[PDB]
Amino acid sequence: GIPPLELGDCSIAGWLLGNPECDRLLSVPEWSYIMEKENPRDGLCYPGSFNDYEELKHLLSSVKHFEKVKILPKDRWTQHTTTGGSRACAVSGNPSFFRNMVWLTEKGSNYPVAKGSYNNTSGEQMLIIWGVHHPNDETEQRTLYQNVGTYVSVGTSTLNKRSTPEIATRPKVNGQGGRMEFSWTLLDMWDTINFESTGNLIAPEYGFKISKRGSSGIM
Ligand SMILES: *[C@@H]1O[C@H](CO)[C@@H](O)[C@H](O)[C@H]1NC(C)=O
Numbered sequence: 487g488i489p490p491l492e493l494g495d496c497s498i499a500g501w502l503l504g505n506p507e508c509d510r511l512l513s514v515p516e517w518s519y520i521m522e523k524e525n526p527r528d529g530l531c532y533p534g535s536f537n538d539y540e541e542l543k544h545l546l547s548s549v550k551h552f553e554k555v556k557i558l559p560k561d562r563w564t565q566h567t568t569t570g571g572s573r574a575c576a577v578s579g580n581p582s583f584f585r586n587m588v589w590l591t592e593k594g595s596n597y598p599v600a601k602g603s604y605n606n607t608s609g610e611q612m613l614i615i616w617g618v619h620h621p622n623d624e625t626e627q628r629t630l631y632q633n634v635g636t637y638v639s640v641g642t643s644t645l646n647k648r649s650t651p652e653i654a655t656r657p658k659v660n661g662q663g664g665r666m667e668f669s670w671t672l673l674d675m676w677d678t679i680n681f682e683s684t685g686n687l688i689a690p691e692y693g694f695k696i697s698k699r700g701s702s703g704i705m
Contacts, residue, residue, distance in 0.1 A: 488550075490705070491517035497526035498543060498704075502615055502694065503668065504585025505531045506577045512585060516551040519702040531575035531584070533659035534617070534666035542670055545613070547703035552694040555612065557604040558681075560588050560691055565598045567591040570630075574660040587617065588689045597632040600689075602681045604673075608695045612673045616640055616681065617688030620652045622663030627653055631685030638683040645671045645679075651686040 493501060496508040498520075504512065507528040530536070560568050570589030571581035583589055590600055606612050618638045621627045627634050639648040647669060656663045666688055673679050673693065681689060 488516055488518045490519050490521050492521045493523070493526065495523070495527045497529035498522060498546060499530055499536050499539070499668070500526065500528040502613075503530070503587055505529065506575055506582055506585060507531070509585070513554070514552075516698050518550070520546060520704040522704060530666065530668075531660060532572050532664075532666050533574070533662055534620075534668065537667065537669040543704055545672070548699055548701065549696050550700040550702075551696075551698035552613070553608075553697045554586070554692045555608050555695050556691060557612075557614065557679075557693040558588070558602050558689055558691055562602060563588065563590055563600065563689075565593060565596075566600055567593045572662065574662050586615075586690060586692045588691050589619075590683070590687055590689060591630045592632045595632065597685050600681070600683045600687055602689065603678055604693070605678045606673045606675055608693075609675070610695045610697060611675060613670060613694040613696065614673055614679055615668055615670045615690055617666045617668045618649045618651060619686045619688055620654070620665045620667060621686075622653075622655055624653055626664060627651070627685075633685070636683070636685030638687045640669075640671070640679065640681055642671060642673055642679045643677045644674070
């Protein structure tokens with residue numbers, strides 16, 4: 487009291503993305519510090535990578551509480567399918583997905599340009615994560631996103647990242663040759679994040695407003 491946040495089997499990635507095995511951590515109160523195991527099992531259910539992961543762990547050492555803000559409600563994506571799930575993130579024998587993320591896919595045999603924006607009027611700096619899906623092959627690319635030749639652009643006043651998916655056969659991990667590469671940014675108060683993609687975007691539905699700052703950290 488104030489108690490630590492013990493992640494148990496969950497990694498910081500699993501917690502923030504909302505790996506379904508980490509559902510116990512969907513809403514957490516203020517903590518004194520964060521306790522993570524040396525090699526947590528529950529991280530990226532759909533396999534992949536997380537850019538600047540150590541730097542995110544260092545930022546979390548100075549955060550003592552988050553408030554999840556619904557920055558991009560799933561219903562806003564009216565021209566895309568948002569129900570996308572995988573057996574890699576299965577819940578009760580059914581395909582599912584990261585709780586805080588949205589897999590945008592083709593709807594009615596079309597993937598029109600996906601655009602979304604959020605103005606940080608939350609009252610504090612906000613951590614936002616998004617992903618890029620790197621399929622296993624061109625057949626997978628066309629099935630999910632209609633065509634080969636796509637991009638994912640994310641921008642703020644301090645960020646300009648415009649990614650191209652890498653289509654490549656890979657050894658199966660968690661039943662998948664595809665990979666999802668996640669990145670993060672800190673959106674300043676009153677700044678706007680803009681998302682634009684012609685395919686392969688794993689959009690956040692939530693952002694994490696930094697509600698309490700303080701020293702102690704991550705064990
Ligand atoms: C974001 O919201 C703040 C509200 O205080 C406003 O000052 C600013 O104009 C907004 N950004 C845009 C792009 O409208």
